[PDB]
Amino acid sequence: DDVRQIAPGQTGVIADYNYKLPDDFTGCVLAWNTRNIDATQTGNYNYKYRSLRHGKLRPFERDISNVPFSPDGKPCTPPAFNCYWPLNDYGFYITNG
Amino acid sequence: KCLDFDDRTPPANTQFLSSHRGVYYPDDIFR
Amino acid sequence: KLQDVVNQNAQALNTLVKQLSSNFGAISSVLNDILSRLDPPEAEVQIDR
Amino acid sequence: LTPSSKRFQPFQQFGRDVSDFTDSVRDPKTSEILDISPCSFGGVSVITP
Amino acid sequence: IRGWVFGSTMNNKSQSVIIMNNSTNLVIRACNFELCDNPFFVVLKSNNTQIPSYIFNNAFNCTFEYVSKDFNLDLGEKPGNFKDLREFVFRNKDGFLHVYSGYQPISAASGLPTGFNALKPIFKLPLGINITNFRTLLTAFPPRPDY
Amino acid sequence: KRISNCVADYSVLYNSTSFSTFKCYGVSATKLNDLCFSNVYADSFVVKG
Amino acid sequence: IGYQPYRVVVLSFELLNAPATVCGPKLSTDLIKNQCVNFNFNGLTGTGV
Ligand SMILES: *[C@@H]1O[C@H](CO)[C@@H](O[C@@H]2O[C@H](CO)[C@@H](O[C@@H]3O[C@H](CO)[C@@H](O)[C@H](O)[C@@H]3O)[C@H](O)[C@H]2NC(C)=O)[C@H](O)[C@H]1NC(C)=O
Ligand SMILES: *[C@@H]1O[C@H](CO)[C@@H](O[C@@H]2O[C@H](CO)[C@@H](O)[C@H](O)[C@H]2NC(C)=O)[C@H](O)[C@H]1NC(C)=O
Ligand SMILES: *[C@@H]1O[C@H](CO)[C@@H](O[C@@H]2O[C@H](CO)[C@@H](O)[C@H](O)[C@H]2NC(C)=O)[C@H](O)[C@H]1NC(C)=O
Ligand SMILES: *[C@@H]1O[C@H](CO)[C@@H](O[C@@H]2O[C@H](CO)[C@@H](O)[C@H](O)[C@H]2NC(C)=O)[C@H](O)[C@H]1NC(C)=O
Ligand SMILES: *[C@@H]1O[C@H](CO)[C@@H](O)[C@H](O)[C@H]1NC(C)=O
Ligand SMILES: *[C@@H]1O[C@H](CO)[C@@H](O)[C@H](O)[C@H]1NC(C)=O
Ligand SMILES: *[C@@H]1O[C@H](CO)[C@@H](O)[C@H](O)[C@H]1NC(C)=O
Ligand SMILES: *[C@@H]1O[C@H](CO)[C@@H](O)[C@H](O)[C@H]1NC(C)=O
């Protein structure tokens, strides 16, 4: 469901916080299904994505940090209230749609 | 490692004029 | 004859102002409306018109 | 295509005139600058009774 | 002047790129750096030789690496007025760091000499890092140890 | 259904729902955060794929 | 997947023409007068006094 977000001018969790294309992008985008390789019966959680970020990432900009996220913006610890881990794991199963 | 310098003067941020400097080639086309 | 000359000059400038409300194949003649609503790629098509 | 006296820097491959027409190119195999010119340069008129 | 360090937080909480030029070759390293608060090179003034110095403590999770060809650099202290002017333009756009360079012989004693110089593009580094801050890297000439 | 007097922050839709189809007409998706909307209605139904 | 159920929501609205009660997440500022400013009014952006 996130493949459609790999395109210039898109919005979403991937386009905002993970990967963005320029409005004047020149190139090609290729995607193919890998359910046989990247999915398992017990579930594959090795792939992640950033779900929380204060500002949208710029075109072709990358953010590989892992800092606890607070909507207020102050530093916090994960056990504290309103403090989360920005990275969420994809749950890839064989039986997934 | 990570050595520190003691008894340092503040920079005071002196100001100057750019003059005509800072021009760079805008593209790869020969003109 | 002198009045006709001054009338034509004023009429030409007033026609110029009224033609700013003109769409030319665009969604709107208001430049701010287009820019507040579209990306630079999509607004480029309307602004060029 | 004619030999050119233009000197290209290593980061330049094409050249353009004031009309933005590509008039110079560095040959890939042999790094020589060549001049591109239009094939039409004729002023032609026809006289008929 | 040996190079620069460009990064958003200037610690190991984010990626930073170092374009330092050591005595032997130019090194561009975009990595997760535990940057020292006071990074420098050290060349002994009497000896005119470069000895190892630390710019960062540790490096990890790191993406981009480039090493230039070997060349010889003169570390000796020099007398007189300023002899060289090296101009650079750094631009960060679309995940690329554009570096434009130019060189000029000058004889000014102080200030920035007036003039015109066109900088040619030398680098287009595909780093894709957020750059909001930078720090220059200067070499030190310590005459006595501990000073 | 009519929607009024609210803040359209769709970032809360992240991590809760996943849309296979999302297409906007007359507006830009990246422009959705900077706009105020008038007479907004939501139509709900179910179709097949 | 062709014969699986899909829930569809269609949002309809108007932009920059009528009073708006639904707005995107933005922080308002103090009203500055008699100066050239970049203004945003219910999603309508521009420059003026
Ligand atoms: C300036 O920085 C460059 C790049 O970091 C330094 O060059 C690198 O120096 C290291 C240590 O000498 C080299 O590692 C060695 O590689 C050889 C095999 O080539 C191996 O047998 C040694 O055990 C060691 O791993 C590294 O290859 C070399 N990189 C290149 C290609 O230049 C350079 O020494 C620095 N100069 C100074 C300290 O001013
Ligand atoms: C580059 O990093 C800076 C600093 O982390 C980012 O600035 C933050 O931006 C967000 C969203 O506007 C604010 O909520 C924070 O308060 C800002 N922090 C500081 C200290 O300035 C900046 O957005 C980043 N740029 C990109 C696009 O990656
Ligand atoms: C690329 O290949 C071409 C064809 O082999 C080279 O052109 C020839 O080069 C040889 C040796 O210099 C000459 O004797 C021939 O007369 C050349 N022929 C042509 C087509 O002019 C060309 O020099 C090669 N370029 C590079 C990058 O090595
Ligand atoms: C990231 O940087 C921090 C701050 O420099 C490092 O924390 C220091 O770690 C060293 C070695 O264990 C200690 O001597 C310091 O006292 C620590 N300082 C603080 C403020 O905690 C941290 O170890 C670095 N992490 C990595 C992986 O490089
Ligand atoms: C001077 O430099 C050489 C080569 O690096 C070194 O062997 C020598 O010990 C140095 N002498 C001093 C003054 O430290
Ligand atoms: C590098 O990134 C990964 C994934 O975010 C993290 O698990 C790892 O701890 C990071 N590097 C180190 C050694 O801190
Ligand atoms: C989604 O985000 C909410 C916070 O808005 C959190 O409580 C929840 O654990 C997250 N994950 C889900 C719903 O799978
Ligand atoms: C809807 O509510 C259920 C029950 O609380 C929850 O499990 C599910 O994740 C929610 N989905 C959305 C779209 O928030």
XYZ file of C-alpha atoms and ligand atoms in Angstrom:
650
model
C 0.000 0.000 0.000
C 3.016 2.322 0.358
C 4.328 1.843 -3.195
C 1.967 4.518 -4.546
C 3.733 7.049 -2.299
C 7.003 6.624 -4.256
C 6.187 9.394 -6.734
C 6.767 13.167 -6.928
C 4.115 15.272 -5.230
C 2.798 12.534 -2.932
C 1.866 12.650 0.747
C 1.847 9.926 3.366
C 3.946 8.377 6.090
C 6.613 7.265 3.601
C 6.685 10.461 1.534
C 6.838 12.711 4.604
C 9.157 10.871 6.995
C 10.985 8.178 4.997
C 11.652 9.014 1.333
C 10.717 11.957 -0.890
C 11.143 12.643 -4.614
C 11.690 16.137 -6.056
C 8.930 17.880 -7.971
C 11.307 18.063 -10.961
C 12.414 14.439 -10.596
C 14.066 12.832 -13.625
C 14.400 9.063 -13.609
C 12.392 5.869 -13.290
C 10.735 4.046 -10.382
C 10.647 0.236 -10.324
C 8.867 -1.954 -7.776
C 8.260 -5.703 -7.635
C 6.601 -8.050 -5.165
C 8.879 -10.126 -2.920
C 6.417 -12.075 -0.780
C 8.380 -15.289 -1.357
C 11.675 -13.764 -0.182
C 10.849 -11.112 2.427
C 7.860 -12.783 4.136
C 7.740 -15.750 6.508
C 5.070 -17.813 8.237
C 6.223 -16.646 11.672
C 6.381 -13.054 10.407
C 9.309 -10.911 9.278
C 9.992 -7.783 11.348
C 13.441 -6.850 10.012
C 12.052 -4.004 7.888
C 11.129 -0.722 9.575
C 9.870 2.755 8.736
C 9.761 6.113 10.505
C 6.228 6.898 11.683
C 6.838 9.993 13.840
C 8.895 13.054 12.856
C 8.636 16.752 13.716
C 9.043 18.002 10.150
C 8.755 16.545 6.665
C 11.981 15.266 5.089
C 13.382 17.140 2.119
C 13.741 15.590 -1.394
C 16.414 12.865 -1.382
C 17.086 13.407 2.334
C 17.621 10.563 4.799
C 17.098 10.306 8.569
C 18.551 7.184 10.197
C 18.475 8.467 13.780
C 16.614 6.692 16.593
C 15.631 9.316 19.178
C 12.508 9.083 21.383
C 9.718 11.272 20.028
C 7.585 13.632 22.109
C 4.791 15.660 20.453
C 5.697 18.569 22.734
C 9.268 18.454 21.402
C 11.203 18.128 24.665
C 13.580 15.208 25.312
C 11.963 12.221 26.995
C 12.445 8.570 27.950
C 10.410 5.737 26.368
C 8.739 4.699 29.660
C 7.441 8.253 30.131
C 3.963 9.266 29.012
C 3.645 10.779 25.522
C 7.086 9.453 24.525
C 7.346 6.928 21.692
C 9.920 5.237 19.478
C 9.746 6.797 15.991
C 10.459 3.565 14.082
C 7.734 0.976 13.473
C 8.325 -2.537 12.146
C 6.584 -3.895 9.080
C 4.905 -7.181 9.900
C 5.394 -9.317 6.793
C 3.507 -12.623 6.856
C 2.797 -15.141 4.115
C -0.958 -14.883 4.752
C -1.021 -11.078 4.470
C -3.056 -9.426 1.756
C 41.829 12.417 22.214
C 39.266 15.253 22.309
C 41.895 17.676 23.591
C 40.684 21.087 24.755
C 42.284 24.518 24.388
C 42.144 26.769 27.456
C 42.310 30.570 27.751
C 40.857 31.406 24.341
C 39.773 34.856 23.134
C 36.217 35.285 21.825
C 36.120 35.822 18.055
C 34.157 39.121 18.272
C 32.802 38.423 14.755
C 34.537 41.057 12.642
C 32.651 42.210 9.542
C 33.869 42.825 5.989
C 32.423 43.375 2.511
C 31.914 40.614 -0.047
C 33.008 42.838 -2.987
C 32.448 40.925 -6.279
C 33.455 37.476 -4.997
C 31.383 34.301 -4.884
C 30.435 33.834 -8.548
C 30.452 30.231 -9.776
C 29.603 28.467 -13.016
C 25.826 27.827 -13.004
C 25.798 24.796 -15.334
C 27.933 22.577 -17.565
C 27.162 24.323 -20.874
C 30.009 26.007 -22.745
C 29.310 29.637 -23.648
C -10.930 66.274 -31.042
C -8.693 66.914 -28.034
C -11.254 65.260 -25.752
C -11.352 62.217 -28.039
C -7.585 61.775 -27.645
C -7.646 61.807 -23.842
C -10.663 59.482 -23.823
C -8.871 56.860 -25.924
C -5.766 56.895 -23.717
C -7.790 56.454 -20.523
C -9.950 53.763 -22.135
C -6.879 51.771 -23.191
C -5.425 51.757 -19.666
C -8.772 50.812 -18.109
C -9.143 47.936 -20.576
C -5.687 46.743 -19.509
C -6.762 46.628 -15.857
C -10.058 44.857 -16.566
C -8.233 42.177 -18.569
C -6.471 40.987 -15.401
C -9.729 39.265 -14.387
C -9.364 37.211 -17.582
C -8.788 33.486 -17.495
C -6.833 32.094 -20.440
C -7.615 28.387 -20.236
C -6.715 28.499 -16.534
C -8.667 27.445 -13.456
C -8.714 31.008 -12.112
C -7.413 34.479 -12.892
C -6.379 34.960 -9.249
C -2.684 34.122 -8.989
C -2.857 33.692 -5.206
C -5.719 31.191 -5.489
C -3.688 28.953 -7.812
C -0.525 29.172 -5.701
C -2.394 28.423 -2.467
C -3.862 25.235 -3.896
C -1.399 23.474 -6.232
C 2.168 22.188 -6.225
C 4.800 24.052 -8.279
C 4.470 21.393 -11.017
C 0.673 21.681 -11.201
C 0.649 25.459 -10.699
C 3.233 25.879 -13.476
C 0.672 24.779 -16.079
C -1.919 27.292 -14.869
C 0.507 30.178 -14.304
C 1.992 29.761 -17.786
C -1.498 30.144 -19.257
C 30.166 18.786 -38.471
C 33.394 20.791 -38.708
C 36.485 21.015 -36.492
C 36.135 23.663 -33.797
C 38.669 25.927 -32.088
C 36.555 26.075 -28.920
C 38.214 24.890 -25.711
C 36.042 22.740 -23.468
C 36.664 22.272 -19.773
C 36.542 18.650 -18.548
C 33.057 19.139 -17.061
C 31.568 20.498 -20.320
C 30.234 18.373 -23.185
C 27.842 20.615 -25.162
C 27.847 24.265 -26.154
C 25.055 26.637 -27.099
C 24.811 30.006 -28.831
C 22.608 32.990 -27.951
C 19.650 31.123 -29.502
C 20.200 28.130 -27.152
C 20.987 26.036 -30.246
C 23.601 23.341 -29.618
C 26.492 24.471 -31.824
C 29.426 22.623 -30.217
C 29.985 19.111 -28.883
C 32.962 17.101 -27.642
C 33.237 13.815 -29.525
C 33.092 10.898 -27.051
C 35.649 8.552 -28.607
C 38.148 11.283 -29.546
C 37.890 14.281 -27.241
C 37.818 16.886 -30.020
C 35.397 19.804 -30.123
C 33.192 19.844 -33.221
C 31.014 22.630 -34.610
C 27.398 21.952 -35.602
C 25.922 24.113 -38.356
C 22.529 24.079 -40.107
C 22.358 22.500 -43.551
C 20.126 25.267 -44.996
C 21.854 28.551 -45.843
C 20.201 29.617 -49.097
C 18.434 32.742 -50.245
C 16.329 31.536 -53.156
C 13.824 33.378 -55.340
C 11.997 32.234 -58.471
C 11.387 34.434 -61.519
C 8.486 33.426 -63.744
C 6.381 35.002 -66.476
C 42.664 25.254 7.091
C 42.162 21.524 6.519
C 38.424 21.067 5.955
C 34.979 21.273 7.498
C 32.408 19.199 9.361
C 28.759 19.693 8.312
C 25.858 18.360 10.428
C 22.466 19.055 12.050
C 23.318 18.348 15.740
C 27.098 17.882 15.461
C 27.171 14.707 17.568
C 26.463 10.983 17.151
C 22.710 11.556 17.196
C 22.753 12.384 13.463
C 24.866 11.895 10.356
C 27.654 14.368 9.578
C 30.116 14.709 6.697
C 33.807 15.556 7.130
C 35.764 16.915 4.161
C 39.090 17.236 5.967
C 42.292 17.134 3.968
C 44.993 15.323 5.871
C 48.652 15.661 4.966
C 48.467 12.890 2.355
C 45.090 12.990 0.580
C 41.595 14.465 0.672
C 39.092 12.376 2.644
C 35.320 12.873 2.436
C 33.536 10.741 5.030
C 29.789 10.982 5.676
C 29.228 8.956 8.837
C 27.720 9.031 12.335
C 30.500 10.847 14.184
C 31.125 11.378 17.892
C 32.666 14.743 17.108
C 35.145 16.289 19.515
C 34.096 19.735 20.718
C 37.523 21.108 19.692
C 38.847 19.214 16.645
C 42.223 20.085 15.179
C 45.316 18.817 13.437
C 48.740 19.049 15.083
C 51.925 19.953 13.234
C 55.041 20.648 15.320
C 56.346 24.110 14.492
C 60.040 23.227 14.712
C 59.629 19.773 13.166
C 57.258 20.766 10.308
C 55.810 17.259 10.547
C 52.240 16.073 11.040
C 51.512 13.725 13.936
C 48.214 11.866 14.422
C 45.331 13.921 15.804
C 41.696 13.158 16.587
C 38.711 14.795 14.911
C 36.177 12.246 16.193
C 36.106 9.572 18.884
C 33.999 6.855 17.224
C 32.303 6.236 13.877
C 29.430 3.898 12.996
C 26.307 3.451 10.911
C 28.052 5.258 8.291
C 27.248 5.622 4.617
C 29.553 7.633 2.346
C 33.310 7.281 1.854
C 35.709 8.841 -0.656
C 39.517 9.017 -0.636
C 41.495 11.225 -3.003
C 44.812 10.466 -4.667
C 48.006 10.819 -2.654
C 49.667 14.235 -2.721
C 52.253 16.149 -0.702
C 51.272 19.124 1.463
C 53.638 21.626 3.082
C 53.049 21.835 6.842
C 55.819 24.344 7.558
C 55.001 27.707 9.086
C 55.664 30.545 6.673
C 56.743 34.177 7.138
C 55.296 37.301 5.590
C 51.797 38.240 4.533
C 48.985 35.980 3.364
C 49.992 34.348 0.080
C 46.971 32.271 -0.998
C 43.210 32.812 -1.192
C 41.082 29.675 -1.516
C 37.395 30.264 -2.244
C 34.653 27.654 -1.934
C 30.889 27.677 -2.363
C 28.911 25.025 -0.474
C 25.281 24.420 -1.471
C 22.929 21.741 -0.120
C 20.108 20.842 -2.504
C 18.112 17.703 -3.349
C 20.372 15.440 -1.324
C 23.519 16.758 -3.030
C 26.319 18.850 -1.558
C 27.702 21.015 -4.362
C 31.248 22.271 -3.786
C 32.690 24.925 -6.106
C 36.361 25.873 -5.794
C 38.718 28.626 -6.885
C 42.233 29.798 -6.090
C 43.978 33.171 -6.267
C 47.452 34.500 -5.372
C 47.103 37.521 -3.083
C 49.433 39.675 -0.992
C 46.941 41.252 1.424
C 48.042 41.642 5.037
C 44.520 41.768 6.497
C 40.888 41.601 5.459
C 39.325 40.025 2.401
C 40.911 41.315 -0.831
C 38.493 42.786 -3.350
C 38.137 41.252 -6.784
C 36.250 38.820 -8.991
C 36.803 35.080 -9.380
C 34.650 32.384 -10.987
C 34.538 29.146 -8.996
C 34.472 25.906 -10.940
C 32.420 22.899 -9.761
C 34.665 20.337 -8.083
C 32.270 18.168 -6.074
C 28.661 16.947 -6.136
C 28.468 14.633 -3.128
C 25.372 12.401 -2.790
C 25.017 12.553 1.001
C 21.308 13.158 1.585
C 21.921 14.559 5.068
C 20.317 17.460 6.857
C 22.827 20.268 7.174
C 22.030 23.239 9.398
C 25.442 23.816 11.002
C 29.167 23.597 10.221
C 32.596 23.813 11.878
C 35.989 24.531 10.330
C 38.970 22.273 11.051
C 42.226 24.123 11.721
C 45.657 22.697 12.452
C 47.483 23.587 15.660
C 51.161 24.464 16.164
C 51.967 23.544 19.777
C 55.532 24.505 20.731
C 55.454 22.792 24.125
C 53.517 19.679 25.200
C 50.404 20.389 27.308
C 50.200 23.828 25.631
C -22.068 13.150 6.754
C -21.230 16.796 7.452
C -17.907 17.805 9.026
C -17.451 21.184 10.703
C -15.359 22.945 13.355
C -12.304 20.705 13.411
C -8.606 20.413 12.600
C -7.903 18.124 9.634
C -4.631 16.583 10.829
C -4.431 13.352 8.833
C -1.107 12.400 10.443
C -3.214 10.627 13.073
C -4.472 8.395 10.251
C -0.920 7.051 10.015
C -0.225 3.888 12.041
C -3.994 3.348 12.354
C -5.250 2.912 8.778
C -3.673 2.155 5.401
C -5.260 3.321 2.144
C -4.771 1.428 -1.098
C -6.350 4.343 -3.002
C -5.942 8.046 -2.218
C -6.480 10.587 -5.000
C -7.325 14.286 -4.752
C -8.978 16.367 -7.482
C -8.988 20.152 -7.681
C -6.388 20.329 -4.891
C -2.865 19.183 -4.072
C -2.137 16.538 -1.455
C 0.988 18.334 -0.218
C -1.163 21.483 0.064
C -3.728 19.825 2.351
C -2.029 20.963 5.574
C -1.975 24.685 4.714
C -5.638 25.112 3.710
C -9.014 25.715 5.331
C -11.993 23.849 3.895
C -15.623 24.922 3.517
C -18.736 22.717 3.368
C -16.808 19.463 3.718
C -18.831 16.245 3.520
C -17.758 12.613 3.838
C -19.522 9.945 1.782
C -19.120 6.367 2.987
C -19.903 3.129 1.177
C -18.503 -0.312 0.322
C -17.686 -1.661 -3.143
C -15.729 -4.591 -4.480
C -12.104 -4.440 -5.562
C -8.518 -9.204 -4.749
C -10.961 -8.226 -7.493
C -13.879 -9.571 -5.437
C -12.789 -8.449 -2.008
C -14.626 -5.723 -0.071
C -13.246 -2.190 -0.126
C -14.442 0.660 2.078
C -14.585 3.989 0.230
C -14.784 7.483 1.732
C -15.152 10.480 -0.592
C -14.451 13.901 0.929
C -15.947 16.926 -0.839
C -15.173 20.547 -0.010
C -14.647 24.050 -1.374
C -11.522 26.198 -1.218
C -10.849 29.911 -0.726
C -14.380 31.057 -1.614
C -16.598 30.700 1.490
C -16.196 30.846 5.278
C -14.407 27.756 6.571
C -14.776 25.902 9.871
C -12.470 22.939 9.099
C -8.810 23.925 8.958
C -5.414 22.303 8.632
C -2.986 22.253 11.555
C -1.253 25.640 11.602
C -0.208 28.134 14.269
C -1.743 31.577 13.889
C 0.200 34.774 14.561
C -0.594 38.325 15.621
C -2.313 40.629 13.135
C 0.257 43.094 11.761
C -1.019 46.196 9.968
C 0.446 48.983 7.818
C 3.401 46.798 6.783
C 4.351 44.606 3.839
C 3.836 41.033 5.053
C 3.333 37.502 3.767
C -0.233 36.741 4.823
C -2.170 33.483 5.075
C -5.932 33.810 5.630
C -7.846 30.510 5.829
C -5.443 29.000 3.313
C -5.298 32.041 1.003
C -1.645 33.090 0.813
C -0.171 36.273 -0.597
C 1.959 39.351 -0.014
C 0.689 42.825 0.782
C -0.186 45.521 3.285
C 44.911 10.336 5.524
O 43.686 9.617 5.391
C 43.783 8.490 4.517
C 42.409 7.842 4.392
O 41.933 7.495 5.696
C 44.833 7.508 5.027
O 45.001 6.457 4.073
C 44.705 5.177 4.662
O 45.645 4.808 5.667
C 45.349 3.565 6.299
C 46.387 3.327 7.390
O 47.697 3.427 6.821
C 45.322 2.443 5.265
O 44.950 1.213 5.899
C 45.939 0.202 5.624
O 45.697 -0.469 4.387
C 46.678 -1.454 4.064
C 46.328 -2.078 2.719
O 46.262 -1.049 1.726
C 46.734 -2.511 5.159
O 47.762 -3.460 4.857
C 47.021 -1.857 6.501
O 46.990 -2.845 7.536
C 45.968 -0.796 6.774
O 44.680 -1.407 6.912
C 44.311 2.779 4.178
O 44.323 1.785 3.148
C 44.652 4.125 3.563
N 43.649 4.473 2.575
C 43.950 5.035 1.406
C 43.484 4.283 0.195
O 44.560 6.087 1.315
C 46.164 8.226 5.163
O 47.149 7.347 5.717
C 46.003 9.428 6.075
N 47.274 10.121 6.167
C 47.669 10.767 7.262
C 47.618 9.982 8.539
O 48.045 11.925 7.226
C 17.202 19.572 10.084
O 17.425 19.511 11.489
C 16.843 20.578 12.230
C 17.250 20.395 13.685
O 16.932 19.060 14.093
C 15.329 20.576 12.037
O 14.746 21.672 12.756
C 13.592 21.217 13.493
O 12.407 21.315 12.702
C 11.227 20.843 13.347
C 10.054 20.988 12.388
O 10.021 22.327 11.886
C 10.981 21.638 14.621
O 9.835 21.114 15.300
C 12.198 21.545 15.526
O 11.996 22.358 16.686
C 13.428 22.027 14.774
N 14.589 21.897 15.632
C 15.524 22.841 15.705
C 16.441 22.750 16.889
O 15.631 23.723 14.869
C 15.025 20.674 10.546
O 13.619 20.608 10.285
C 15.702 19.533 9.807
N 15.421 19.669 8.389
C 15.062 18.643 7.619
C 14.093 18.969 6.524
O 15.488 17.513 7.784
C 37.513 4.697 -28.383
O 37.506 3.717 -29.416
C 37.749 4.286 -30.702
C 37.633 3.178 -31.743
O 38.531 2.117 -31.400
C 39.111 4.975 -30.722
O 39.296 5.615 -31.987
C 40.482 5.121 -32.638
O 41.628 5.159 -31.789
C 42.805 4.626 -32.390
C 43.947 4.696 -31.383
O 44.031 6.026 -30.858
C 43.141 5.404 -33.655
O 44.288 4.823 -34.283
C 41.962 5.373 -34.614
O 42.255 6.171 -35.766
C 40.731 5.919 -33.912
N 39.581 5.846 -34.794
C 38.651 6.799 -34.817
C 37.226 6.327 -34.819
O 38.941 7.983 -34.835
C 39.150 6.041 -29.639
O 40.435 6.670 -29.588
C 38.858 5.398 -28.296
N 38.849 6.406 -27.258
C 39.267 6.157 -26.021
C 38.515 6.858 -24.929
O 40.199 5.405 -25.792
C 27.771 9.009 21.487
O 28.247 10.201 22.107
C 28.046 10.210 23.519
C 28.467 11.571 24.060
O 29.813 11.847 23.660
C 28.825 9.053 24.141
O 28.666 9.034 25.564
C 29.973 9.045 26.171
O 30.609 7.771 26.106
C 31.942 7.769 26.612
C 32.524 6.370 26.461
O 31.638 5.424 27.071
C 31.941 8.208 28.070
O 33.287 8.261 28.554
C 31.298 9.579 28.197
O 31.228 9.953 29.576
C 29.896 9.533 27.613
N 29.304 10.854 27.679
C 28.014 11.037 27.946
C 27.532 12.454 27.878
O 27.270 10.111 28.228
C 28.332 7.746 23.531
O 29.052 6.623 24.052
C 28.536 7.810 22.029
N 28.075 6.580 21.417
C 28.735 5.991 20.422
C 28.214 4.645 20.018
O 29.696 6.508 19.876
C 59.864 14.817 14.065
O 59.164 14.065 13.074
C 59.713 12.772 12.836
C 58.899 12.088 11.746
O 57.512 12.138 12.094
C 59.696 11.957 14.123
O 60.305 10.683 13.891
C 60.457 12.696 15.211
O 60.371 11.967 16.440
C 59.853 14.077 15.397
N 60.612 14.803 16.395
C 60.018 15.544 17.326
C 60.629 16.889 17.583
O 59.036 15.149 17.930
C 22.669 1.945 13.849
O 21.289 1.929 13.493
C 20.596 0.769 13.952
C 19.137 0.846 13.518
O 18.585 2.112 13.901
C 20.706 0.654 15.466
O 20.068 -0.552 15.898
C 22.162 0.638 15.903
O 22.176 0.598 17.333
C 22.866 1.879 15.359
N 24.295 1.881 15.628
C 24.852 1.838 16.837
C 26.020 0.908 16.978
O 24.448 2.518 17.765
C -0.419 3.587 16.726
O -0.313 4.843 17.415
C -0.994 4.872 18.678
C -0.881 6.285 19.200
O -1.633 7.194 18.408
C -0.388 3.835 19.620
O -1.104 3.843 20.850
C -0.449 2.450 18.991
O 0.240 1.512 19.810
C 0.182 2.469 17.595
N 0.155 1.151 16.961
C -0.908 0.416 16.567
C -2.284 0.988 16.797
O -0.759 -0.683 16.044
C -10.308 0.809 14.955
O -10.637 0.424 16.290
C -10.137 -0.867 16.639
C -10.565 -1.201 18.061
O -10.116 -0.168 18.944
C -8.619 -0.890 16.511
O -8.134 -2.200 16.820
C -8.212 -0.514 15.096
O -6.785 -0.463 14.994
C -8.794 0.849 14.764
N -8.430 1.220 13.407
C -8.270 2.491 13.048
C -8.547 2.803 11.606
O -7.936 3.350 13.847
